[PDB]
């Protein structure tokens, strides 16, 4: 069921695309669409809703999802692939240098 | 299960007009019998039921583009509360 290699908390860097380079906290993960939303790829929605709440308002600037592959997690270094290590309970994501978050 | 025999109050001009006399109408279970609805209302609203009228309400056919279907069939009971009594739960 959709493996997925980054979570809500994580601090990812956008490895490719237009926001190649940027670094951000993934706000939301969307396993169904295999995508995450970070702080890159944000766009300009025409906010019709002039009538309901959000009057006058012509537009909005929500942040669009990103193919989950477009991002990589980081820690005292750059991005890493992920290695999983077994303790004496269950496993945890350790980068290819140290470890990932408390 | 008596709260299973009685589904919901039927909310309509016609239904409301019934409150004047002791006549309250409910959506009931379609397999529920008149005798069963008496006791069901009797123990649900601590009232004496005196007359029970029922009728089936066929589902309306409705489509949503391409796909056309039907809404569930229903049953209405118009119940006659004894002289002087009242279902306060419906008087709103």
């Amino acid at each position: 069921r959709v493996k997925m290699h980054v979570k809500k908390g994580d601090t990812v860097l956008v490895a490719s695309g237009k926001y190649k380079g940027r670094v951000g906290k993934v706000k939301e993960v969307l396993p169904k669409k295999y995508a995450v939303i970070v702080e890159g790829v944000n766009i300009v929605k025409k906010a019709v809703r002039v009538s309901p709440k959000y009057p006058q308002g012509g537009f909005i600037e929500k942040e669009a999802p990103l193919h989950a592959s477009k991002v990589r997690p980081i820690c005292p270094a750059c991005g890493k692939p992920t290695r999983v290590r077994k303790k004496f309970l269950e496993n945890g994501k350790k980068i290819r240098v140290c470890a990932k978050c408390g | 299960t008596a709260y299973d025999v009685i589904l919901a109050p039927v909310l309509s001009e016609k239904a409301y007009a019934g409150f004047a006399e002791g006549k309250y109408t409910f959506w009931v279970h379609p397999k529920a019998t008149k005798t069963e609805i008496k006791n069901a209302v009797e123990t649900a609203f601590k009232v004496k039921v005196v007359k029970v009228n029922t009728l089936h309400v066929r589902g309306k056919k409705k489509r949503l583009g391409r796909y056309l279907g039907k809404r569930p069939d229903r049953k209405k009971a118009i119940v006659q509360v004894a002289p002087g009594q009242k279902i306060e739960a419906l008087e709103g």
Binding site: - | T1, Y3, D4, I6, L7, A8, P9, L11, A44, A89, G92
Partner: protein, 66 residues
Amino acid sequence: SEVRKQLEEARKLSPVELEKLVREKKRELMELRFQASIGQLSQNHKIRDLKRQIARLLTVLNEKRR
């Protein structure tokens, strides 16, 4: 979660008591319905919880008779 507690409470508790409790929640449900029926007088998720909660008692009642 809040549920496992209720499950423990329900288990170890007489069938007669279980039937009593069911009949009760069953009545509460009817009330949730009528509120929802006249609209804007309810808040969904409760109709589901209770409906699903009435199931839990009935399944434990089953164990206690089986």
